[PDB]
């Protein structure tokens with residue numbers, strides 16, 4: 001049982017040149033890496049090489065128009081980069097952004113390939129910029145290309161079209177990009193847990209609500225678990241996995257599990273405002289390892305407290321490596337209502353509920 005780890009410092013090049021303190025810092029991935037070194041987790045892993053995604057691979061999920069525009073940013077001068085970035089919801093762009101986006105996706109491709117060919121059982125990808133807000137034709141919320149969505153399509157490309165992929169998105173924000181790409185798809189099961197606040201939390205859309213179960217053949221295969229007022233923690237997430245994520249996943253019988261692993265739901269994160277502990281993430285990870293013969297790829301999304309996310313993602317790697325789960329109140333009423341809402345919404349599609 002081998003765990004893969006992919007990390008490249010070239011992904012640090014992507015930066016905000018008008019605010020060097022912008023929360024999506026280059027140092028996010030470097031601090032996670034060093035913590036993996038420090039805890040002797042890195043030395044236990046099989047080092048998977050990073051690579052650039054090709055344009056043909058980007059076309060698995062993205063329009064050529066979207067690809068061309070972001071590609072052209074590599075040759076732009078600072079003010080043009082400023083203007084282009086302002087055409088999007090919450091995006092900054094540097095000359096290196098396009099290349100870093102390519103490495104993020106290519107790294108995840110190589111990890112998926114390693115898992116699916118049996119070189120490793122599972123893998124962790126310490127990458128940036130993130131991906132899950134990125135749409136087919138647009139960039140959004142610090143994301144340029146949808147790394148997770150692309151990896152699902154890449155995985156199917158190197159296996160068979162009907163490879164069943166589960167994408168679990170435990171980043172505090174709804175992965176609107178991932179939901180939309182696969183909304184009519186029944187080969188990719190998208191499950192997201194996210195702070196919703198009745199549509200008044202980024203990315204501020206009712207697409208993130210529980211009632212959005214998918215379209216056409218894809219009905220049932222989109223699971224939104226929205227949190228409303230207010231601070232949520234380990235109890236809420238554990239209960240969500242127990243009643244929803246793991247029962248549905250088992251019935252879906254995935255062959256590959258991708259985790260859109262943001263750690264902005266972690267205690268200490270300003271943008272999330274939740275209190276999922278590092279031990280919390282370990283237990284979520286451990287549960288997912290019971291799926292798909294352990295074929296699990298952990299892909300970094302959001303998470304902005306450098307100490308919180310280094311410790312949190314390290315905890316997940318420890319689990320993938322096979323360490324025993326660390327030792328961990330009744331649910332908030334609102335959380336219970338959220339879970340019953342999803343249960344009632346997905347009753348027709350999943351007989352296990």
Ligand SMILES: [K+]
Nearest residue numbers: 169171173193
């Ligand atoms: K999420």
Ligand SMILES: [K+]
Nearest residue numbers: 182185188221
């Ligand atoms: K789907």
Ligand code: NA
Nearest residue numbers: 220221349350
């Ligand atoms: Na179903």
Ligand SMILES: [Zn+2]
Nearest residue numbers: 173262264302
């Ligand atoms: Zn996030």
